[PDB]
Amino acid sequence: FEKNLKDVSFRLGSFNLEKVENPAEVIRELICYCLDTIAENQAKNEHL
């Protein structure tokens, strides 16, 4: 991943990755979390 100044890219860091064997499971987890997050702000806005 990099940084763009002076009309040129300038790389910041770089990571060794690996494909997960269970994409759908991390996906459920992330999005359950996200659902929770939105709902919270919803309730807060109501009270406000």
Partner: protein, 67 residues
């Protein structure tokens, strides 16, 4: 380098190996740092001639005419 220098003409360090002068810049670019080193050998006496002396003679005599 130009954008850095023209204002000043970031931090700099200089060192002279036996004959050559070595100039080091500590700065940053794109947020990220940028390091470069200048490696300037002792300049030539034609270069010395043309860049300093003959022009500097020229200075001296022209200001004499001024006076």
């Amino acid at each position: 380098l130009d954008n850095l220098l023209r204002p000043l003409l970031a931090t700099f360090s200089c060192d002279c190996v036996a004959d050559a002068l070595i100039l080091r810049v500590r700065s940053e670019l794109s947020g990220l740092p940028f390091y470069w080193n200048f490696h300037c050998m002792l300049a030539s006496p034609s270069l010395v001639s043309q860049h300093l002396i003959r022009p500097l003679m020229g200075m001296s005599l022209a200001l004499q005419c001024q006076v």
